[PDB]
Amino acid sequence: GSSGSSGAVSTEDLKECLKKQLEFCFSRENLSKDLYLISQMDSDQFIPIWTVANMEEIKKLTTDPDLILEVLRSSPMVQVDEKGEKVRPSHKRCISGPSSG
CATH code of the domain covering residue 18: 1.10.10.10
For the chain, the residue count is: 101
- Residue-wise DSSP of 20-57: HHHHHHTSHHHHHH-HHHHHHS-TTS-EEHHHHHH-HH
Q: Return the half-sphere exposure (C-beta side, CA atoms, 13 A cut-off) of residue 68.
A: 23
Q: Return the half-sphere exposure (C-beta side, CA atoms, 13 A cut-off) of residue 79.
A: 12
| Integer-rounded Cα radius of gyration of the chain | 14
- Residue-wise DSSP of 65-99: HHHHHHHHHHSSSEEE-SSSSEEEE--S----SS-
Q: CA 19, 25, 26: angle at the middle one, nearest 5?
A: 95
Q: In what order do the strands lie in the sheet with 47-48?
A: 47-48, 86-89, 78-80
**Cβ neighbours of residue 62 closer than 8 Å, sequence gap 6 or more:** 14, 18, 68, 71
In the chain, the number of structural domains is 1
Whether 14 and 63 have beta carbons less than 8 Å apart is answered as: no
* Domain limits for position 97: 1-101
